[PDB]
Amino acid sequence: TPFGLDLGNNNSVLAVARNRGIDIVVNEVSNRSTPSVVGFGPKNRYLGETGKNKQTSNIKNTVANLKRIIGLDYHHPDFEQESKHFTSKLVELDDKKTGAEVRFAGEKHVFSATQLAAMFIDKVKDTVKQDTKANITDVCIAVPPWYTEEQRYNIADAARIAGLNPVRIVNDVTAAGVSYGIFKTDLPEGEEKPRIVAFVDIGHSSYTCSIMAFKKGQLKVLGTACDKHFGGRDFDLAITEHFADEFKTKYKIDIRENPKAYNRILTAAEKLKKVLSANTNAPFSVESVMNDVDVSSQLSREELEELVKPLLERVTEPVTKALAQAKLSAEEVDFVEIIGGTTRIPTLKQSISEAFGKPLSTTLNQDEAIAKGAAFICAIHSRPFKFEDIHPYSVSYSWDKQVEDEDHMEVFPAGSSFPSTKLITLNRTGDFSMAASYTDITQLPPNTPEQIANWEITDSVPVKLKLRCDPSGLHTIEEAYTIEDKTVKKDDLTIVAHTFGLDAKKLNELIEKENEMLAQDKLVAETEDRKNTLEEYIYTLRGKLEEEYAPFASDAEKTKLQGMLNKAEEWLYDEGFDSIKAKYIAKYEELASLGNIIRGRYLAKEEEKKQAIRSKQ
Amino acid sequence: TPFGLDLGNNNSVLAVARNRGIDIVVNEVSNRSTPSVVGFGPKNRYLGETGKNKQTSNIKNTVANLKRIIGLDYHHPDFEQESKHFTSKLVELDDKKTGAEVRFAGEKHVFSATQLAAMFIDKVKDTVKQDTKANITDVCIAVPPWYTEEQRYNIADAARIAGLNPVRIVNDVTAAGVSYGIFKTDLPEGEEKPRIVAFVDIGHSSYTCSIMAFKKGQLKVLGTACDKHFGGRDFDLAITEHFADEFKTKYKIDIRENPKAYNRILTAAEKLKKVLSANTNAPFSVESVMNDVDVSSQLSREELEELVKPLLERVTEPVTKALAQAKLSAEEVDFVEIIGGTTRIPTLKQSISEAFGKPLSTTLNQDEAIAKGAAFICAIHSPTLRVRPFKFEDIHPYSVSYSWDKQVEDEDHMEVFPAGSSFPSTKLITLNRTGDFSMAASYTDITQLPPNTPEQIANWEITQLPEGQDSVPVKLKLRCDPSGLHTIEEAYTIEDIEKTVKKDDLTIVAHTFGLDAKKLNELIEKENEMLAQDKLVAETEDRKNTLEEYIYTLRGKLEEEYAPFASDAEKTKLQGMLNKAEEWLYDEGFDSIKAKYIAKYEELASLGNIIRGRYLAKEEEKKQA
Ligand SMILES: Nc1ncnc2c1ncn2[C@@H]1O[C@H](COP(=O)(O)OP(=O)(O)OP(=O)(O)O)[C@@H](O)[C@H]1O
Ligand SMILES: Nc1ncnc2c1ncn2[C@@H]1O[C@H](COP(=O)(O)OP(=O)(O)OP(=O)(O)O)[C@@H](O)[C@H]1O
Ligand SMILES: [K+]
């Protein structure tokens, strides 16, 4: 079953392609999104919903912002902008990336961002399995367009650790554009000019604007621009920093000194923010914030807009930047579509409508567009719809000079489209190395390494190579063979690839490690359920003996069972407090063996009553 | 429907007589008992289970120990023993009794003990009505045997405020004895020696021992003794005081300075106590007790037994005193039966088994016997259901005298119901009268009563024609009623004109601990106002939730099942109205009236039901084609 995943900073949305079309998959408490949280306990992990519920009580061992630390160099210049949203300890790894340090299973543990992502992916995979009752094998994962090539490899490997095959890592707004494309049945055709649609997605952490050209059965991305430091969490954080100051004066409590107090305010601040999307004033009240002090305040929409004024100075930058890339003026855009939870804020809606000079459209589902798009894309593997995403930076390939007059060439230019295949023929005097790099490093984000990937391969013998920018926008070499003199195939050379993607050895180590953790989670939950089943059976069976089952057992049988029930409870206090699954099942069955005999006699007179009613009619 | 109420200090149990038996009524979360708690909030009362849940949150406005403050003089010498279990403010009332001061509906309110008890009774009455779908009009309430005559009147009037006729106020252990009596099928008959059974009930606050004689269809109480300051709450308190001291040293937090912190430990201390009924060692762990400090300790059974040592010095006293009243040695009792939650404590079982010289029996259900006995007693009264009869006499421990105006009579004074007699009891007396006269009932020997007991129980005025012969003889019917209350039932002149011919029925004005019609009706009306406000708030919230949930599910269905059954135009008109409804809920629908939540829903459904109809029409074709 094809599986689409919108992995959000705040919540993830799951979609599957089945029957006619594409359904959202609900979680175990029937929610249409799952909090993107990973928590750790003394016995097991708290993944998703239960992770989020324990976020204040388990504060130091709860990891969120999972997609943000993926591929994050510990000395990235934006480290602290990411760091301030963490509640657990972040640490430097051997590879110079970022992990989390947690108390888990009575011990200190360090997990990498790739592992932590896999834990959550595995959780949502299990959620789709419990819903579909099917084997889940392939995933399409939607990511923000600002995701680096490295980050795209990392998240893909996280999928593989979760035991899933990542068929494509798609850009999120592009996945949503697909959902718009497969939905609309009035699109321009043939000679007609395309429909120009602008998409604005503002979520918990990211703000993206993407401009796309639409014809019937196809789309082309013309321009994409992102502000990765623009989203809901920045509004929540401004509110709580404001109240931190006010409560210090008002209540003589400093919530910055108590991580739990701070998180109680942060959590309430999100709710107050939403009230202000609808109302111009909102009260603010939280019980037992710190030292059992109840706080009471308020905030106006005007005051809120002032708190984020430095952030709001960049509100039109993504639209301006996207238009410029698209070579378009704001007049030339036909429709403007908004998605993401944060586009619900009035000041933001005012600004982007004013920037395009056009009213905002809500054709797409705010929360489900991206996930359903990815589920369609995943299904594409096995309604034809073509789409090409934009390739921002020019990428060159290089090789050993040798007998060839040149050693490098621009292969995929800036403003190009992906996926893209470019066929190259090279004269060779022996085995050779290759490498893909960015043509103009100045056009890339600060601190990007120039080299993308490299390869080893195997008067002059010609070789045809297939260079590809794949559907995920990653830079590969697909095949390598020799020519013989129109043309003939001679020999295939083995390619050894070195990319950001993990080697099989490391990948298998991390797969076996996630299997161990998952089996532990399963074992703990099933053990707890058998314990709970026994406890409830003791409780109800005692109550039935004092009622319905009373006429249906001798004094000798009742005292036997009653003593067994008392002994069962006694056991649950002692060796049954933290026992194994088989023992809870065994104690249950020995009670039920006698409990079912009585129920069998009960149900015998129950039939007799029904017969007595019928014989009187 | 006969209703029996076991009103516990910690929890209450409800029983009804129906079908061919007596059943326990479960509450709104399917629990077989209800927390005996009354809390107050900005819009409504939190009664029972919801009162208990908000107990730490709403600590200053949560009233428990309801049955302990009934009839409680603010200057009672045991006042502090009672008040240390209170989390809300206790105040003195105009009548010298005790009430509670709370914040309720945005204001400061003082409620009397009788009012507070009526709030709770009214809650459990609603619970019975929702289980039976009938109207409930009568109750039998089980009370501890140490309840004074005044307290019995107060709780009866609390039942009246709650709209119930209290048919009997029964001693709780007597009610459990009836349960035993109607359950056993092998009791002695005719001339055979009666079976002597001792009953021991230790609950949350009280410890009662009662010795009874049983024959088929009857019981007689032979002796009763109580310790009203001996119960589970005294174990919980000892544990939490122990930890209060420990945590000052270990964690540098003082839970006695923070009532919420204290209650967090008190609540966990009860769970630890129960662990120690089964195990000899127990770990103690509470998260965020105070200032977000987690605490982690342990306690042994031996350490617990040491903490309650001063309490355990008194552990054989109720059995010793009941046996002495019964005039029996311990070996003359045939069976010892235990009930009440706290009889689960190993040290207590050992001690009471040693005092009798007998293993303990658990014939009766530990938690349900009293409530069931009370429902049966309520059912013997009511002239609708006929059951197999069971007679019971309870013990009347104090001597009660009646007095009257001297007039032509030699004495003005007479013992009527002696110490160690039985109730109910009726005595006929003849009095020669020279005019309308006053009477009074009082305790014959006050030194035999609890300290500070007023000597007078009740008094009467009688308003009687001399019949021209200096002095007319009047016959009076004096009664100790089935609840143990002392009244004058009947008063009338007799004449020899025929010899046994009655002359005139006389008017009796009675002054009891019972409330007068005027005051009762005032409190009834108050309870009706509060109860109507509770129903309105609950209904309004339900209609709001129904609207909210409908917005949620209808939006989803337009994406999943209703897509083919609505046009582009139907979808966006409904989508918009859903949006407007959500906005309204943030603004004018935030705290609106019930009719507006209903109107908003109906507006959405008038559109939504059109679409559901079409979906439902095709769903039927599929179950065929
Ligand atoms: N009515 C509302 N008013 C204001 N903010 C809202 C509203 N509804 C949702 N939000 C905000 O939207 C954010 C969640 O939106 P969304 O699910 O689009 O983000 P995400 O996909 O988890 O994050 P990202 O895409 O940035 O990784 C939260 O910060 C939430 O508070
Ligand atoms: N296994 C146990 N071990 C120790 N104590 C227990 C156990 N089970 C229940 N209890 C205690 O028994 C008390 C409740 O008993 P019960 O229901 O008989 O009291 P009650 O009727 O509310 O109080 P009272 O009769 O004093 O007014 C509580 O203190 C509870 O903690
Ligand atoms: K999301």
Ligand SMILES: [K+]
């Ligand atoms: K009880």
Ligand SMILES: [Mg+2]
């Ligand atoms: Mg998003």
Ligand SMILES: [Mg+2]
């Ligand atoms: Mg009791």
